[PDB]
Amino acid sequence: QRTPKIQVYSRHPAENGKSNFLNCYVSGFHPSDIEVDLLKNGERIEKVEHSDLSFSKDWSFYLLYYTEFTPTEKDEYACRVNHVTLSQPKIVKWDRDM
Amino acid sequence: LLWNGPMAVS
Amino acid sequence: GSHSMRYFFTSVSRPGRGEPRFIAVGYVDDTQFVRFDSDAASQRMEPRAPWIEQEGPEYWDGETRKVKAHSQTHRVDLGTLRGYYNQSEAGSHTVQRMYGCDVGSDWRFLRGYHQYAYDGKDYIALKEDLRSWTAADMAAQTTKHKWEAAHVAEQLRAYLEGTCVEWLRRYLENGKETLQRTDAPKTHMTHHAVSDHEATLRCWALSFYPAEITLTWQRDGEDQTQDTELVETRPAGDGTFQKWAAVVVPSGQEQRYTCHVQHEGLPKPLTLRWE
Ligand SMILES: [Cl-]
Ligand SMILES: [Cl-]
Ligand SMILES: [Cl-]
Ligand SMILES: [Cl-]
Ligand SMILES: [Cl-]
Ligand SMILES: [Cl-]
Ligand SMILES: [Cl-]
Ligand SMILES: [Cl-]
Ligand SMILES: [Cl-]
Ligand SMILES: [Cl-]
Ligand SMILES: [Cl-]
Ligand code: NA
Ligand code: NA
Ligand code: NA
Ligand code: NA
Ligand code: NA
Ligand code: NA
Ligand code: NA
Ligand code: NA
């Protein structure tokens, strides 16, 4: 078993009011079963898609979860990940600088 | 194009 | 430059009910071009790049037949390997397979490979000579003896040196507009105050293809790794990739630091400086 790494980021440098894509990239994990949600102000976003499962040279898996979003000043976005290696879900907040 | 030759079982 | 065609396959057993989940992905270089997912509705190999959509029905029927054959082999193997390892029928387990071929700048065969893993660890792999097998343990040794008796390596070698390369070349030509285009990284630096005396400089590489890239920091012309952070290269979602590297510096000394960016799409490496 291997625990997931997580990066939460926008496809494009964010500007408020300009449609964009919110990405949660999970990688380095095994086994491949994993629960990933994108959150807006703590609530699950319904229209979330993901890439087809692939894997790296150490056999660990990676997936991109993504949805269209329009960033604003006050809305908080996050990625919530659960996996057998985690005692509880891990929540990573989106920071527009990273 | 995928490999066609028999996918030998382990 | 050089090119590759690679196929990736994952099967995950479902002891509670039903058959394994099976996901197959095909790539040319860092471009996904086909997929199969046992959970999807089509039950067909599906296109994922515009330049493969021109292939006719014989192609799609044949790729669907073959990918389903791969899936059945994996299903059988999950049962066989559970037995080799004296494991319970109650647990879920995983088989992963990756094979493919590389060509050089002249589009001639460079190397081929076929790797197989059980529960995320090496199980059996074709050696670079395309003749011999590397077995990680005694279960894989049993498999190696089976594959020697069935002369698997011979058939695989013929595919890797012939069909694999010939079809890679076909795809490279049909998809030339994108597959033969390099997208150099769009680079910039950001600056973040972290105290009266520290600042963070973050060097960005955006929208690049292929994914391979090197970002390095120097201070007064010498590589620096202390006080740096380099994130894993990550997909933008539009077929390109992103990466950044950051360094913490004493506020006011930013000009000593340079970020160096190497990528196939750059005739010369780029140097960025906060000025
Ligand atoms: Cl992480
Ligand atoms: Cl952009
Ligand atoms: Cl932007
Ligand atoms: Cl997809
Ligand atoms: Cl998908
Ligand atoms: Cl991928
Ligand atoms: Cl066989
Ligand atoms: Cl290339
Ligand atoms: Cl479905
Ligand atoms: Cl089609
Ligand atoms: Cl680092
Ligand atoms: Na929402
Ligand atoms: Na918003
Ligand atoms: Na066959
Ligand atoms: Na065989
Ligand atoms: Na059951
Ligand atoms: Na889908
Ligand atoms: Na074991
Ligand atoms: Na692409």
**Residues C255, C159: one domain?**
no
Number of domains in chain C: 2
Chains within contact range of chain A (3+ C-beta pairs < 8 Å): C
Give the separation between CA C263 and CA C185, rounded to whole angstroms. 7
Residue C204 and residue C188 share a domain:
yes
Tell me: do C175 and C39 sit in the same domain.
yes
Q: Which of C231, C240, C241 to mutate to test the interface with A (most CBs of A within 10 A)?
A: C231
Asked whether the beta carbons of C209 and C241 are under 8 A apart, the reply is yes
Is residue C87 located within the same domain as residue C202? no
- Which chain A residues in 32-61 lie under 8 Å from chain C, judged by CB atoms? 32-33, 51-55, 59-61
One-letter amino acid for residue C46 of the chain:
E
Residue C275 forms part of a structural domain: no
On the 0-12 / 13-18 / 19+ scale of CB atoms within 10 A, C218 is middle
> Which residues, at least 6 apart from C190, have a Cβ–Cβ distance to it below 8 Å?
A97, C201, C202, C204
Query: Which domains occur in chain A, in start order?
Result: 1-98 (2.60.40.10)
CATH number of the domain encompassing residue C154 = 3.30.500.10
Final resolution, Å? 1.5
Question: Chain B within 8 Å of C35 (Cβ-Cβ)?
Answer: no
Residues C162 and C88 grouped into a single domain: yes
Domain residues for the domain of C227 are 182-270
Asked if residue C170 is part of any domain, the answer here is yes
Is A29 in contact with A4 (CB distance < 8 Å)?
A: yes
Domain co-membership, C96 together with C207: no
Assess contact for B1 and C63: CB atoms under 8 A: yes
**C155 and C189 part of one domain:** no
Domain assignment present for C123: yes
User: Does residue C146 fall inside a structural domain?
Assistant: yes
Q: Are C103 and C43 part of one and the same domain?
A: yes
- Answer yes or no: do C149 and C188 share one domain: no
For residue C180, the tally of other CB atoms under 10 A from its CB is: 12
Q: Do the Cβ atoms of C164 and B7 come within 8 Å?
A: no
Query: Is there a domain that residue C207 lies in?
Result: yes
Structural tokens at position C115: 């790797």
CB–CB contacts below 8 A, B to C: 52
Taking an 8 Å cut-off on Cβ atoms, the answer to whether A52 and C32 are in contact is: yes
Smallest Cα–Cα separation from C95: which of A21, A77, A17, A31? A31
Method by which the model was determined? X-ray
